[PDB]
Design a protein around this ligand. Structure first.
Ligand SMILES: *[C@@H]1O[C@H](CO)[C@@H](O[C@@H]2O[C@H](CO)[C@@H](O)[C@H](O)[C@H]2NC(C)=O)[C@H](O)[C@H]1NC(C)=O
Ligand SMILES: *[C@@H]1O[C@H](CO)[C@@H](O[C@@H]2O[C@H](CO)[C@@H](O)[C@H](O)[C@H]2NC(C)=O)[C@H](O)[C@H]1NC(C)=O
Ligand SMILES: Cc1c(Cl)cccc1Nc1ccccc1C(=O)O
Ligand SMILES: *[C@@H]1O[C@H](CO)[C@@H](O)[C@H](O)[C@H]1NC(C)=O
Ligand SMILES: [Fe+3]
Ligand SMILES: [Zn+2]
Ligand SMILES: [Zn+2]
Length: 341
């Protein structure tokens, strides 16, 4: 064993990472960067080993040679004999969510509305909806489709950032890390809940986890699922209990990536760290829970039951799936070979 150097994105992940490192007796230590892209560069340079990534960022890391190691696995819909670590992953449902009270907004009337996105380059947040929209409109001018948005990672003076709010101080508007008030699944959903945006592009789970008292957080504690609808590609609106019939795509789960040459070591260490700090882990909750952060999804989604071994030593293309990979390649033609770095 060597120590594994985790890469934390922004200061709130970094703080979580430091508690993990303390509790692991330095089996894990922490590098931190301002953006996911910057953490991927640290890993490429060998200044960090690994981080957990959305599928759109796996595409970026993968084009640069990093490889998937273990995947987030959340509670299966169906009972399984299989241990979590062995259970195959089931993707998550990317959806578009609006206020029920915003009547008559549908997928087909999104143009010139206000949008909330988890971040540029992320799956449910970006790649799926904007790939869909570019294709449906026949235009690469996706930066002109909504009147204003919060899409963290975009140009802070552009309309794609006009709705983002920055941190407590109002600084770091539109930065793609949890300091941006509207960053990520929970930030984009809060962007909708507070009626900053007309639509949020998130996943099905986000809606459930932040409504009907599932979150105690001040902005979320009062929210009721019935006040929300999903937008279906057929132009219909459904209640959020129907995401299986009204989603934009099924996404590949967030997964850990590292360099090939560190993958087996990163895997071993993680399997052991989750035995200690994961769901039901020997030292969670008394000491530290790797998969909790007060709904802030820091390092890992809060709904992760375990990190699960992958079948078939998949390359990043195999992990993401050919179709998703081709959807991303297609969209990036708007703004098929090389590492972006
Ligand atoms: C947007 O349209 C593109 C361009 O047609 C779609 O790309 C095709 O996807 C199919 C199914 O995976 C492939 O058989 C074709 O080879 C792809 N065409 C090209 C030119 O690459 C893409 O999937 C659509 N995007 C989204 C997000 O649905
Ligand atoms: C959409 O996401 C929600 C939230 O994760 C899912 O509801 C959970 O489903 C599990 C497994 O069925 C239940 O044991 C949980 O108690 C549910 N959580 C809550 C907060 O209600 C829901 O199944 C997902 N829907 C689809 C179609 O995938
Ligand atoms: C539509 C869908 C369902 Cl329903 C389930 C699962 C996936 C999809 N779609 C896609 C899957 C991968 C890549 C691109 C797409 C897309 O067409 O946006
Ligand atoms: C640190 O790692 C070594 C080697 O795997 C092991 O003996 C020890 O259990 C680990 N401790 C923690 C607290 O993760
Ligand atoms: Fe995602
Ligand atoms: Zn589907
Ligand atoms: Zn293979």
């Amino acid at each position: 064993y060597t120590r594994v150097v985790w890469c934390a994105v922004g200061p709130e992940e970094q703080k979580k990472c430091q508690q993990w490192s303390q509790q692991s007796g330095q089996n894990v230590t922490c590098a931190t960067a301002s953006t996911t892209d910057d953490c991927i560069v640290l890993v490429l340079k060998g200044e960090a080993d690994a981080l957990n990534l959305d599928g759109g960022y796996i595409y970026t890391a993968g084009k640069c040679g990093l490889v998937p190691v273990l995947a987030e696995n959340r509670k299966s819909s169906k009972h399984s004999s299989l241990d979590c670590v062995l259970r195959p992953t089931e993707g998550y449902l990317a959806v578009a969510v609006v206020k029920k009270a915003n009547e008559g907004l549908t997928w087909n009337s999104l143009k010139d509305k206000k949008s909330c996105h988890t971040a540029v380059d992320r799956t449910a947040g970006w790649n799926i909806p904007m790939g869909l929209i570019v294709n449906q409109t026949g235009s690469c001018a996706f930066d002109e489709f909504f009147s204003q948005s919060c899409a963290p990672g975009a140009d802070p003076k552009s309309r794609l950032c006009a709705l983002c709010a920055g941190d407590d101080q109002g600084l770091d508007k539109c930065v793609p890390n949890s300091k941006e008030k509207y960053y990520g699944y929970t930030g984009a959903f809060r962007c909708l809940a507070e009626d900053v945006g007309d639509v949020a592009f998130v996943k099905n789970d986000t809606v459930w986890e932040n409504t009907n008292g599932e979150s105690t957080a001040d902005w979320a504690k009062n929210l009721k699922r019935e006040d929300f609808r999903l937008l279906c590609l057929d132009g219909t609106r459904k209640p959020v209990t129907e995401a299986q019939s009204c989603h934009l795509a099924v996404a590949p789960n967030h997964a850990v990536v590292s360099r090939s040459d560190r993958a087996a070591h990163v895997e071993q260490v993680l399997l052991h760290q989750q035995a200690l700090f994961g769901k039901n882990g020997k030292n969670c909750p008394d000491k530290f829970c790797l998969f909790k952060s007060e709904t802030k999804n820091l390092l890992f989604n809060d709904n992760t039951e375990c990190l699960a071994k992958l079948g078939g030593r998949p390359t990043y293309e195999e992990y993401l799936g050919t179709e998703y990979v081709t959807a991303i390649a297609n969209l990036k033609k708007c703004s098929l070979e090389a590492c972006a770095f």
